[PDB]
């Protein structure tokens, strides 16, 4: 019902590649932060 999503021409029609959300991205960001420090402290003394 939102007028921003109304499409009148086929220019903005595309296939759905994947989907994502907030609860997934928060955990993903935390994991990506911690893995970096873990690997860095593993590689060097």
Partner 1 sequence: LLPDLIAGAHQNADPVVLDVSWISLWFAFNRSFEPTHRNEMLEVAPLIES
Partner 2 sequence: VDVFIGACSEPVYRIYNRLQGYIEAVQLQELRNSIGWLERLGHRKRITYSQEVLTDFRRQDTIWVLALQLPVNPQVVWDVPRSSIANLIMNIATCLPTGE
Residues that bind partner 1 (CB under 8 A): 5, 14, 17, 20, 22, 29, 32-33, 36
Residue 10 DSSP class: G
Residue 4 binding: pick among partner 2, partner 1, none (C-beta 5-8 Å cut-off by kind): none
Give the nearest distance from C-beta 9 to partner 1 in angstroms: 16
Residue 7 neighbours by CB under 8 Å, 6+ apart: 13
Determine contact, residues 7/13, Cβ cutoff 8 Å. yes
- Binding-site ranges for partner 2 (CB under 8 A): 33, 36-37, 40, 43-44
């Amino acid at each position: 019902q939102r007028p921003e999503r109304i499409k009148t021409t086929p220019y903005l029609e595309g296939d759905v590649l994947s989907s994502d959300s907030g609860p997934l991205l928060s955990v993903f960001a935390l994991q990506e932060i911690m893995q970096k420090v873990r690997q860095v402290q593993a590689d060097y003394m």
